[PDB]
Amino acid sequence: QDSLSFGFPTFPSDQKNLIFQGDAQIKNNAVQLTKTDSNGNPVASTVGRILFSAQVHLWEKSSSRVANFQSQFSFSLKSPLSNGADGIAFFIAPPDTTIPSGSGGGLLGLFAPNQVIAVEFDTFYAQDSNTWDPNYPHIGIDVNSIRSVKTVKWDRRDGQSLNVLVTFNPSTRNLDVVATYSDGTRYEVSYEVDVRSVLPEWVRVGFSAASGEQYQTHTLESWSFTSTLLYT
Amino acid sequence: QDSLSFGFPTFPSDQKNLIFQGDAQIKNNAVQLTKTDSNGNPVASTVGRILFSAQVHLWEKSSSRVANFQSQFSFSLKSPLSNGADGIAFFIAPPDTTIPSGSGGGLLGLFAPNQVIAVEFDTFYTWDPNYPHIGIDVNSIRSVKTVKWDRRDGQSLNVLVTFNPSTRNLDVVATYSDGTRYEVSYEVDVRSVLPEWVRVGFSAASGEQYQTHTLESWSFTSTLLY
């Protein structure tokens, strides 16, 4: 299909179109990307991801078309600890994508110790950070093997839902990210990216999260997506 | 998802989200449900179907909701014979649905010699056997309602099938390019015949009499409503 749209206001336990990888599973009408115990509390050393089952036609060389797409979602991070980790990311990758071996902790279940475009919301500490202040969480745009090619300072709020809208306009090639907390606190980050230079024509979209020794829940509460091929 | 929509203006050969069953395959940027030879001519004794890969949440008991959905598509039938057969149908069925054994010919690859709702366009000989007809099927009851239809070799028929959960009315409107129109509607509580989650698609077949069943385009939308 040239166009595909879907919306999950919530995530009831009886899902059919989500591909669960790692520890990801549905609990309390939401997707718990990382493992939680019987009390709903996060546990260490866990990685999980979800992908929508239907493949998305991101671009088509034969018709010189590229898709205009938008992904809207909300998540919340909760941790009994003071420094929850490591983060959650929205990503776009080849259809057969699976959790790389050893991609735990700061690797978010997306990178090995590749073809991908992702937007990560990190809360982990990386002393050697080269594109963001390591002393504070950050939102970063990833392109292929370059993580956080563009970033913006962000604030972690335990138990608070962050509403995010990620949009891509093939005419300008701008990948825009706008995230807001319920009080209106806003974070913005944008970057120019020709999707044809980093991803195959057909891809799958979804989310990934992980926790190493430091942990927190990565609860995906809602998600809507739309894509349409446009000449170009 | 509560809502799901997809659109196929055409069907290029690089399909990823279609479940092909039987002889169904892509040719000339369209889905040839029934088998064609090297010259593109239809052949006898063939059955084929396609289903979209993503499942549709048609209704949900817990929230007392039923989906409002629409299915728009265009197809054309061509045959060297003057009595092309047997027909093409749009259908809704359980996700694991497969071609029933012995469902060729007039069975359209949908019925065995039962959870399903279909709209069939029959051209072979509850209706006037003298001419083709469009029929609505509910479970094991075929043609619970029908309307006389005219087959036109090589001409595209544009169809819109809609379901309104408030009235439980399943509406069908088909038109040829000259404006000729056919319509048929029937009340059906989808909860009484189908499971909560289903797959949607098309099916077609030809027995000794044959014709192409070319699905040219298809768009679909569904949203659960209170």
Side-chain angles (χ1 to χ4, degrees), chain A residues 2-34 36-77 79-80 82 84-124 126 130-134 137-143 145-152 154-212 214-230, chain B residues 2-34 36-77 79-113 115-123 127 129 132-147 149-226:
Chain A
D2 284 16
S3 59
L4 179 65
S5 299
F6 59 75
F8 297 82
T10 65
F11 293 101
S13 58
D14 184 50
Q15 292 302 306
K16 305 299 179 182
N17 300 314
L18 292 180
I19 297 174
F20 295 95
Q21 307 187 311
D23 302 316
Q25 67 190 71
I26 296 182
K27 293 186 175 181
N28 305 305
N29 293 304
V31 174
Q32 299 308 324
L33 293 172
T34 47
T36 60
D37 57 36
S38 303
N39 310 307
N41 288 141
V43 298
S45 306
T46 172
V47 180
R49 323 195 308 182
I50 64 171
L51 294 173
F52 187 69
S53 63
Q55 288 182 50
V56 180
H57 200 178
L58 184 59
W59 63 285
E60 186 176 63
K61 176 175 293 186
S62 65
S63 65
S64 181
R65 293 188 297 172
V66 180
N68 178 297
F69 68 79
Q70 296 192 300
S71 183
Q72 179 175 297
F73 59 88
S74 61
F75 67 89
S76 60
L77 310 175
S79 177
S82 59
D86 289 271
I88 179 174
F90 165 63
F91 71 116
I92 306 178
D96 62 356
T97 183
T98 55
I99 300 173
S101 181
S103 57
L107 296 177
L108 308 179
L110 291 178
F111 312 86
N114 198 304
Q115 296 184 297
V116 62
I117 290 181
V119 180
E120 41 181 281
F121 300 74
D122 311 319
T123 62
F124 61 78
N130 295 306
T131 57
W132 75 84
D133 192 311
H138 70 294
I139 296 177
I141 294 178
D142 301 341
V143 176
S145 61
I146 314 175
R147 293 181 65 186
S148 294
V149 301
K150 182 73 171 182
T151 70
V152 66
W154 174 52
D155 305 70
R156 178 184 187 293
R157 300 185 178 184
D158 204 71
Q160 288 185 54
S161 302
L162 184 70
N163 313 295
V164 187
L165 177 60
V166 176
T167 68
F168 180 68
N169 182 334
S171 296
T172 58
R173 291 180 182 173
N174 289 311
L175 180 61
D176 293 344
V177 180
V178 179
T180 63
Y181 277 118
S182 68
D183 61 1
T185 300
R186 182 190 182 75
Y187 309 85
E188 298 179 359
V189 63
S190 175
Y191 196 75
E192 190 194 322
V193 60
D194 187 333
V195 302
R196 304 175 304 170
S197 66
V198 297
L199 292 167
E201 278 192 36
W202 293 83
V203 302
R204 277 202 166 92
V205 296
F207 301 78
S208 183
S211 291
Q214 284 55 291
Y215 49 105
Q216 64 188 175
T217 60
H218 300 77
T219 309
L220 181 69
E221 299 161 348
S222 61
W223 175 40
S224 62
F225 176 98
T226 187
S227 180
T228 305
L229 283 177
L230 300 179
Chain B
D2 283 6
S3 56
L4 178 67
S5 65
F6 55 79
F8 295 87
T10 66
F11 291 100
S13 298
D14 66 348
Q15 292 302 307
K16 306 295 180 179
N17 303 313
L18 293 184
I19 296 176
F20 288 99
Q21 307 188 313
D23 303 320
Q25 55 185 298
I26 301 299
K27 292 183 179 181
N28 299 307
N29 301 77
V31 176
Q32 300 307 324
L33 291 170
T34 46
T36 59
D37 56 47
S38 302
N39 300 299
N41 294 302
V43 304
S45 302
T46 170
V47 181
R49 327 193 309 181
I50 61 167
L51 298 167
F52 189 66
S53 60
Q55 294 179 52
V56 181
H57 199 177
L58 185 61
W59 63 283
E60 186 175 62
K61 180 178 296 183
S62 66
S63 59
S64 181
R65 291 188 292 173
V66 179
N68 174 302
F69 68 77
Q70 294 191 296
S71 181
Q72 181 173 59
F73 58 86
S74 299
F75 67 87
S76 60
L77 310 176
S79 176
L81 306 177
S82 62
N83 62 318
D86 286 278
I88 181 177
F90 166 64
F91 72 114
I92 307 174
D96 62 356
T97 180
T98 53
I99 297 172
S101 183
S103 58
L107 293 180
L108 308 178
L110 290 179
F111 313 81
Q115 302 186 301
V116 68
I117 288 182
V119 178
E120 46 178 281
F121 299 74
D122 308 313
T123 62
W127 70 83
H133 70 291
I134 297 176
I136 294 179
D137 304 332
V138 180
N139 261 46
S140 60
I141 308 176
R142 294 181 65 185
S143 297
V144 297
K145 185 67 172 299
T146 66
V147 64
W149 173 54
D150 305 298
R151 177 185 189 291
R152 297 187 180 179
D153 201 78
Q155 290 182 51
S156 300
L157 184 72
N158 313 297
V159 185
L160 178 61
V161 176
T162 65
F163 181 67
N164 185 316
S166 301
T167 60
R168 294 181 180 178
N169 184 48
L170 178 67
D171 297 308
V172 181
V173 178
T175 64
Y176 280 114
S177 63
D178 70 328
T180 302
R181 174 178 179 176
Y182 312 84
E183 60 189 4
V184 64
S185 58
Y186 192 69
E187 187 193 320
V188 58
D189 186 336
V190 304
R191 303 176 304 170
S192 69
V193 297
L194 291 166
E196 276 193 40
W197 294 82
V198 301
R199 276 197 168 102
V200 293
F202 301 77
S203 184
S206 294
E208 295 307 310
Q209 287 60 61
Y210 46 96
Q211 66 189 175
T212 59
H213 298 79
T214 307
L215 183 64
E216 298 163 347
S217 62
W218 176 37
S219 61
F220 179 95
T221 62
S222 179
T223 56
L224 284 176
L225 299 180
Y226 283 103

